[PDB]
């Protein structure tokens, strides 16, 4: 498959996960039969699904990259704040709304300040930086630039390293998925390598120690994913216990990656009629918790990996602004990849 199919698939997958997952967000239990009924409703017998903050911020991030043909922190921060101002009720986290209001002050010349000051200067460690970051890996092909600009784009709202390292990890997963066919072993090894390096930086250790986390929350979790994948038939309760299904970036980004890797293979509980991308989204939502955001992240990775051949027409055409998303993906390709 060509890279254009992967770019289109990436942003479609992210849109599908947000749209299809939104109904269940914050539900502590999501029966698989309920999710299957939900997706079956997208293929009725012959309203759109609305997107949430995850897509609104992903679109603003991509708009900024297209406009400036590069990461531009001021342009992107203002676009985030203005998008919230225009359409505030999309399901944003309570934490980021405080940053947006501060960014809307003309006297705010340092666009990193509002995020940095949150939580008594510790910053947010939620997954808002990661939920929107896929476009960075479409604009920047080098693994060094992916890390650099995933970090900076995340720091506009999520200044804790526990937040921005989650955004880096997610961006790296999308970056690797763009490379195509891989064993789960190889995929994980490459990600583990990066996180072991990044979690040794001083800020990383300091933030984790301040949080009592016996540290390396991402590296430890990537190791756990390898162990989970080795198990014959792991329960959702174990997956949630070991990895999480939460708003914290370390309780959602590894989980998304697990769902991607796990769902490469068939699941006897999920009808064989569903392809791997559909399976990934169905399973991720069935973990409950922060379902739109875990699914939007798993969907970005799966869409980059499987490309448009696994993006279901029925689901996609059910999603608010799917044509807009697709033309934005094409435009990222033209601006950043075609040359």
- Site map 57..96 versus Mg ion, x via CB under 5 A: ----------------------------------x-----
**What's the min distance (Å) between Cβ of 110 and Mg ion?**
27
**What's the min distance (Å) between Cβ of 18 and Mg ion?**
6
CB contact at 8 A, 167 and 151: yes
125 in a known ligand binding site: yes
> Which residue lies nearer to Mg ion by CB, 292 or 326?
292
- Site map 187..226 versus Mg ion, x via CB under 5 A: ----------------------------------------
Residue number with the shortest CB distance to Mg ion? 52
54 in a known ligand binding site: yes
State whether the Cα torsion 256-22-39-6 is positive or negative: negative
Cβ atoms within 10 Å, residue 16: 33
Q: Is 114 exposed, middle or buried (0-12, 13-18, 19+ CB in 10 A)?
A: buried
**What's the min distance (Å) between Cβ of 91 and Mg ion?**
4
Of 15, 17, 35, 54, the one binding Mg ion (CB under 5 A) is 54
Tokens 């990066």 correspond to what residue?
194
123 in a known ligand binding site: yes
> Which residue lies nearer to Mg ion by CB, 184 or 293?
293
Cβ atoms within 10 Å, residue 82: 14
For the chain, the maximum distance between any two Cα atoms, rounded to a whole number of angstroms, is 59
Binding-site size for Mg ion (CB under 5 A) equals 7
Report the distance separating Cα 307 and Cα 305, nearest Å: 6
> Which residue lies nearer to Mg ion by CB, 8 or 90?
90
161-177 helix and 217-230 helix, angle to the nearest 10 degrees: 40
Cβ atoms within 10 Å, residue 85: 12
122 in a known ligand binding site: yes
> Which residue lies nearer to Mg ion by CB, 9 or 91?
91
CB contact at 8 A, 293 and 11: no
**What's the min distance (Å) between Cβ of 335 and Mg ion?**
27
Report the distance separating Cα 219 and Cα 196, nearest Å: 6
CB contact at 8 A, 292 and 52: yes
Q: Please give the residues from 264 up to 293 whose contact with Mg ion meets the rule CB under 5 A.
A: 290, 292-293
> Which residue lies nearer to Mg ion by CB, 27 or 223?
27
**What's the min distance (Å) between Cβ of 294 and Mg ion?**
8
Please tell me the total number of residues recorded for the chain in this structure: 339
**What's the min distance (Å) between Cβ of 14 and Mg ion?**
11
Report the distance separating Cα 77 and Cα 73, nearest Å: 6
What residues contact 47, with CB distance under 8 A and at least 6 apart? none
> Which residue lies nearer to Mg ion by CB, 251 or 292?
292
- The token pair at 62 is 């991509």
What residues contact 315, with CB distance under 8 A and at least 6 apart? 16, 20, 39, 42, 278
163 in a known ligand binding site: no
333 in a known ligand binding site: no
Q: Candidates 52-60, 180-188, 189-197, 273-281: pick the segment binding Mg ion (CB under 5 A).
A: 52-60
> Which residue lies nearer to Mg ion by CB, 257 or 308?
257
Q: Which residue ranges are tagged as binding site for substrate?
A: 53, 122-128, 158, 211, 247
| Interacting residues toward Mg ion by CB under 5 A | 52-54, 91, 290, 292-293
Q: Which residue ranges are tagged as binding site?
A: 25, 52-54, 122-128, 158, 211, 247, 290, 292-293
């Amino acid at each position: 498959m060509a890279s254009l199919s992967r770019f289109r698939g990436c942003l479609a997958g992210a849109l599908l996960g947000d749209c299809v997952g939104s109904f269940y967000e914050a539900h502590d239990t999501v029966d698989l039969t309920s999710v299957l009924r939900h997706v079956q409703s997208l293929e009725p017998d012959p309203e759109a699904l609305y997107y949430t903050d995850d897509t609104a911020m992903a679109r603003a991030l991509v708009q900024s990259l297209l406009a400036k043909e590069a990461f531009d922190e001021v342009d992107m921060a203002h676009r985030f704040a203005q998008e919230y101002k225009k359409d505030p009720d999309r399901g944003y986290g309570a934490g980021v709304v405080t940053v947006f209001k501060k960014l809307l002050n003309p006297k705010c010349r340092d666009v990193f300040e509002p995020a940095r000051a949150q939580f008594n200067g510790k910053g947010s460690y939620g997954n808002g930086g990661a939920m929107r970051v896929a476009g960075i890996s479409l604009a920047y092909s080098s693994v060094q630039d992916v890390q650099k600009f995933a970090r900076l784009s995340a720091q506009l709202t999520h200044a804790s390293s526990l937040g921005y390292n989650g955004a880096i990890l997610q961006a790296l997963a999308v970056h690797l998925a763009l490379q195509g066919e891989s064993s789960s072993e190889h995929f994980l090894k490459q990600l583990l390598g990066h996180m072991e390096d990044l979690e040794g930086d001083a800020q990383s250790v300091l933030d984790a120690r301040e949080l009592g986390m016996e540290e390396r929350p991402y590296s430890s979790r990537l190791k756990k994913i390898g162990e989970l994948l080795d198990q014959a038939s792991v329960t959702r309760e174990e997956v949630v216990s070991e990895l999480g299904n939460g708003i914290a970036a370390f309780e959602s980004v590894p989980t998304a990656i697990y769902c991607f890797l796990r769902c490469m293979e068939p699941d006897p509980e999920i009808p064989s009629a569903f392809n791997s991308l559909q399976r990934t989204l169905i399973y991720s939502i069935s973990l409950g918790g922060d379902t739109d955001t875990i699914a939007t992240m798993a969907g970005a990775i799966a869409g980059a990996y499987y490309g448009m051949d696994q993006v279901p027409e029925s689901w996609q055409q059910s999603c608010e602004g799917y044509e807009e998303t697709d033309i934005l993906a094409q435009s990222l390709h033209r601006v950043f990849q075609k040359s």
